[PDB]
């Protein structure tokens, strides 16, 4: 029920309308990642780098297993039971993630019976047969580099240089890995980690994982860019150095009776200066309610907005009254900079501030003039079929609305300042004035 006609004279031009949709209904798949390469074909002069690498990796892998063992002990079948007294402190998300973790024990146990086969793989991507009907994929961290570069060149240079190269490669891999799985991973129980972060254990090549898993969705790019694909760790092995990860593939669903409206701001002239209006740019309307939204966490597309969560927030009553046609309740700010927009196009109709920009009609070769009592001008083909703004020639349509648009004015609100130090100064001044008024009242 927005009043676009009144909002236009303030400098707010309507834009594109978009839909609102959120993810739901995930599916599940399991993968295995191996964090140690196979050096069987170059083992003669590998030195002692592997033992040091193992010692470094064990101290990183241990805390994750220690944190995971907490929920393993106190969850048992009974539609599952937990010992609340032993856990002590927890949140709803942690409890839900613990239930989800418990649901994967059967699959983890079935997978764990192939330890000997897992430990013998020597390729970057290997396909294993878990059962007669199900298969499991195994990925190795640095097998490709060893298979491609180090082994063929082993007989042309002294292999102390090969030892140094292998040590440097392992150190670089550890340096890249330490960012995600380090001390920052305080709570591995939750399932909010994206697949992009998880792929750092494979060198950041999540495209290979996604292609191998065989995605079969048309919204794949939108799901990937909106951070709607997540993963969870369900098992850690400290003797074979591998982990098991479960991946979730959700489905996007569209909310009914909801849309988002966009506004384009244009500067306007009131007394002798340029002003702009401070109002939200994106407005969420569902059913018959108006509220704000933080679109910074969402993905903006041409036709719809994709979010992995509901980001609605309340809105003040004065802003709601301002959006409905009460222009005298809408704040404005002074313009000091020179790089501000001064015209916009909407449905073939042109809104421009001709005080600070040239305006002449190309058809009749005459200038367009703005008086001091007007904030903006509406230009259509009723008066000027073709207009020129500097170095551009534009053809215009017909305006749908009041025929007396340029002959009627509106009211304006109070000026404001939006700087932090200015906010503090204004608060101090208002408090001092209120204190003086209270003293006089006493």
């Amino acid at each position: 029920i927005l009043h676009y006609e009144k909002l236009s004279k303030i400098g707010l031009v309507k834009g594109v309308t978009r839909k609102y949709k959120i993810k739901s209904n995930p599916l599940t798949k399991d993968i295995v990642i191996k964090m140690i390469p196979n050096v069987s074909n170059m083992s003669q002069c590998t030195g002692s780098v592997m033992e040091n690498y193992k010692t470094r990796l064990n101290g990183i892998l241990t805390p994750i297993k220690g944190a995971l063992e907490i929920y393993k002990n106190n969850t048992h079948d009974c539609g599952v039971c937990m010992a609340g007294v032993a856990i002590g402190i927890a949140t709803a998300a942690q409890i839900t993630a613990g239930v989800a973790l418990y649901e994967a024990m059967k699959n983890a146990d079935n997978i764990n019976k192939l330890k000997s086969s897992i430990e013998s793989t020597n390729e970057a991507v290997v396909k294993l047969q878990e059962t007669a009907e199900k298969t499991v994929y195994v990925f190795t961290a640095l097998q490709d580099y060893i298979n491609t570069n180090l082994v063929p060149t082993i007989d042309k240079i002294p292999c102390k240089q090969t030892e140094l190269s292998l040590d440097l490669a392992l150190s670089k891999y550890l340096s890249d890995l330490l960012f995600v799985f380090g001390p920052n991973l305080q709570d591995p129980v939750s399932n909010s980690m994206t697949i992009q972060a998880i792929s750092q254990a494979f060198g950041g090549n999540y495209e290979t994982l996604l292609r191998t898993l065989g995605y079969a969705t048309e919204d794949f790019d939108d799901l990937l860019e909106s951070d709607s694909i997540t993963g969870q760790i369900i098992y850690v092995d400290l003797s074979s150095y591998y982990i098991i990860v479960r991946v979730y593939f959700p489905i996007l669903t569209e909310i009914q009776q909801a849309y988002i409206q966009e506004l384009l701001p244009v500067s306007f002239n009131n007394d002798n200066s340029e002003w702009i209006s401070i109002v939200p740019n994106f407005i969420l309307v569902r059913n018959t309610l108006i509220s704000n939204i933080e679109i910074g966490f969402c993905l903006i597309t041409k036709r719809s907005v994709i979010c992995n969560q509901d980001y609605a927030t309340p809105m003040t009553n004065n802003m709601r009254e301002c959006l409905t046609g009460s222009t005298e309740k809408c704040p404005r700010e002074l313009v000091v900079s020179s790089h501000v927009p001064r015209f916009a196009l909407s449905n073939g109709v042109l809104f421009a501030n001709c005080i600070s920009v040239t305006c002449q009609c190309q058809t009749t070769g005459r200038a367009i003039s703005q008086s001091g009592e007007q904030t903006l001008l509406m230009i259509d083909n009723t008066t000027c079929p073709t207009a020129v703004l500097g170095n551009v020639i534009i053809s215009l349509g017909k305006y749908l609305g009041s025929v007396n648009y340029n002959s009627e004015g509106i009211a304006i609100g109070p000026p404001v300042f939006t700087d932090k130090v200015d906010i503090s100064s204004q608060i101090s001044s208002m408090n001092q004035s209120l204190q003086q008024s209270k003293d006089y009242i006493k």
Epitope: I36, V39, S40, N41, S43, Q44, C45, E51, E119, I154
Partner: antibody, heavy 120, light 108 residues
Framework: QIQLVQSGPELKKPGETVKISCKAS????????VNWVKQGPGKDLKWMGW????????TYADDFKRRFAFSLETSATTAFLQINNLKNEDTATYFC??????????????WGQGTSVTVS | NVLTQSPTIMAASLGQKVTMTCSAN???????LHWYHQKSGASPKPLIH???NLASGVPARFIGSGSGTSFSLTISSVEAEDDATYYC??????????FGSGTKLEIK
């Protein structure tokens, strides 16, 4: 199949020299190393050292730094062991083994049949 | 790092279970211990490659366990061909290789 064959028994008088060979077949010779193990009287087992089959650089234990030397013949895939200045305590049985390593653990998967040396 | 085996000789009857021990002068990681066996007139062959992991082709009647400086080997049911000599070995790098004293098994 993988097989290691050594030379036969030999007898020598103190002050002489001895040379023992170890033939390999059935696998890629350059991909694995060779170890030497001594089994003296009393059935004790002691480790002497190993030789790299790529460069030919030998390595000796603390108790075998003086009178022992290793050599290699890549063309015939044969390894040699030579002892100088023989004495009475050298009477024992020697073994040429193989080294296996894949990143998890070390192992001596295949052994020779052994050679007996007697000093009198 | 001297490794000492307590049973110098042991006799057993068919079907009986036996246990051997393997001590260590200092602490040894569980990933560096192996077991070997040798019959008369033959070269040694691997039997167990870790504290518990069996080698290829070894019957499942051999059980190994231990931690710290004390380790042990257990046979659930002896047979006629188990009359060999067993050794405990530690290998934590090329210079650090040590063998045990060995234990001989007899059948009544």
């Amino acid at each position: 199949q993988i097989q290691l064959v050594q030379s036969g028994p030999e007898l020598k008088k103190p002050g002489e020299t001895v040379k023992i060979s170890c033939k390999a077949s059935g696998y890629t010779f350059r991909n694995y190393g060779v170890n030497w193990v001594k089994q003296g009287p009393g059935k004790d087992l002691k480790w002497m050292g190993w030789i790299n089959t790529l460069n030919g650089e030998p390595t000796y234990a603390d108790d075998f730094k003086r009178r022992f030397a290793f050599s290699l013949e890549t063309s015939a895939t044969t390894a040699f062991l030579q002892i100088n200045n023989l004495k009475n305590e050298d009477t024992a049985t020697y073994f040429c083994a193989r080294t296996f390593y894949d990143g998890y653990y070390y192992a001596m998967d295949y052994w020779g049949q052994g050679t007996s040396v007697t000093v009198s | 790092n001297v490794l000492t085996q307590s049973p110098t000789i042991m006799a057993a009857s068919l079907g009986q279970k036996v246990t051997m021990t393997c001590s260590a002068n200092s602490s040894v990681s569980s990933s560096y211990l192996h077991w070997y066996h040798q019959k008369s007139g033959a070269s040694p062959k691997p039997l167990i490659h870790r504290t518990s992991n069996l080698a290829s082709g070894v019957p499942a009647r051999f059980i190994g366990s231990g931690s710290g400086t004390s380790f042990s080997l257990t046979i659930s049911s002896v047979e006629a061909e188990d009359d060999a000599t067993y050794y405990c070995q530690q290998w934590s790098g090329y210079p650090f290789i040590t063998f045990g004293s060995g234990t001989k098994l007899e059948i009544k």
